[PDB]
Amino acid sequence: QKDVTIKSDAPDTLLLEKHADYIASYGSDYEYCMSEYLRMSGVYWGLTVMDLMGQLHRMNKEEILVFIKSCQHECGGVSASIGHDPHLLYTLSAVQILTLYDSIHVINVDKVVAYVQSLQKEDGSFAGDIWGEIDTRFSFCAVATLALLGKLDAINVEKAIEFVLSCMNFDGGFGCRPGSESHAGQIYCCTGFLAITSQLHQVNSDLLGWWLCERQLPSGGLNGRPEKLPDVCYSWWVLASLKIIGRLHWIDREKLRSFILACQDEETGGFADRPGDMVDPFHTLFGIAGLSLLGEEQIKPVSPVFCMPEEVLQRVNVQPELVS
């Protein structure tokens, strides 16, 4: 019942040239400065969306590679920015960027692997950093990082699988930790995890697929759990999860596409979380990635597992089999 009403003057055409201008000029500002704590991921979002649009060249490779190297700490982990602390979230982001750039040896890969290895707990879970927060998001960061480096064998995979499956819920979904309620974000992370570790046969695809397709609201937009507002980034979380489990056809593609197009800003470029709100590069990546999954011809095919161009992943030979 909680939904947004798309007003009839909302954008209904893909403004790609505008989006690429928006990202190309991003960080040339109040909000830029206040999100320094996620900079490495911000950089990943901008570069990935640019590459999906064929505009990667307009970004600054040389400058990003020096930034990334300065963000690797003596433990092997990578921080969001210089002087910030290392975390699995930013280690993943850094590794996705270097994968996009074919420059993995810009950082010490052996130390990244040792960092990831060090964060696994006896029950198979991963902490995000030395301070011990446990989340299935971090199980995904860990195996995704290692998959991209060809080093999945470095962790205890069966225990890691056991922990993730212990976060499966009555409704077929997954939460942060055992007993946590199902949420699209964690479902995305856990289905991604199970794709990487070849365990999708353990998902109840019909049950989870139904929970996911019930995320679509009359507006066409997807929410992240029951009784919440729709949002462009859930487009992505939910749609990617559906693709991994072979049930993408269970949502109304055309209604979702109209929702996503309605979140664009016709003047400034970029996408917001919902129509008419202020845009950012996070929702710009996920709007564009969502459209690509829906089969938008002007955007490169995107991996539902790694949220990177498929041609990048083909090139490193890391393409997990999905359900169907």
Binding site: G83, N169, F170, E227
Partner: protein, 308 residues
Amino acid sequence: KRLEREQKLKLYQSATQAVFQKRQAGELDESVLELTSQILGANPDFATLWNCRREVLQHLETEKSPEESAALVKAELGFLESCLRVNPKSYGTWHHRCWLLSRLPEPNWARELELCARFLEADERNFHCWDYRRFVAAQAAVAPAEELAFTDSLITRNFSNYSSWHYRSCLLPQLHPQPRLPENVLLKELELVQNAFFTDPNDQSAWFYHRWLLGAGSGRCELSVEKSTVLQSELESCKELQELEPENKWCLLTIILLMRALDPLLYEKETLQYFSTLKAVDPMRAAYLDDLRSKFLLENSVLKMEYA
């Protein structure tokens, strides 16, 4: 309006500079707690600053008395609670509280459970708070039965129930911990959930939980007279509801599921009829509904082939 924030940015920027300079200097002191409090209130997702607070608190406990360390802990609890009042949905703030409580000699868990009850009164769907509550319940070794009493009160006092039903799905198996629910428990849960969705037939949470309960038994070939009779009664009650709310998709889906739970082949004709109606009422789910129906027809073909 868009001028003062240039000055608020100025304060954020220099405080942030200050904290990092002090940290490089090995100055793990109260001035960093001062600076970080001024940034984390507005910006609790700045993870590195939570790490600095922990580093300071760890350091200070080495060179302060039990009394002075006890005072720092209580000041940290108040700071944390003021942060949560401003932003109750920050991973960082909740983890810090967990970190803090996990290292105290004698933590007060009854108080932490009450903090949870209060935040859940504000927002019954706050999963950080539900997660914290499960953490506190475990640490205090609170019994499944008590948490079950907490959920009941929450479900009836108002809606926004998905989180409370989810918690029940996890608690119930613990009260009957096999290496599936016992029928007596299952029947009691069916009565509770069915009350919920006849009270508010638009609350999707009860319907999702009811679909789970429908699978959580022992199979249609094993139906007791009592379970058989309860399910038939649910079927007639949903048909009643369908008259009142012809646009209600959850009741139509549930009718199909009930007929399946009762007798797939005897109800084959009505099942097919209900699929047509439901697809007309919920067209965005047409593809799902066609796939579900194809699954059910295959099940039926196998049942017809099982014949002697």
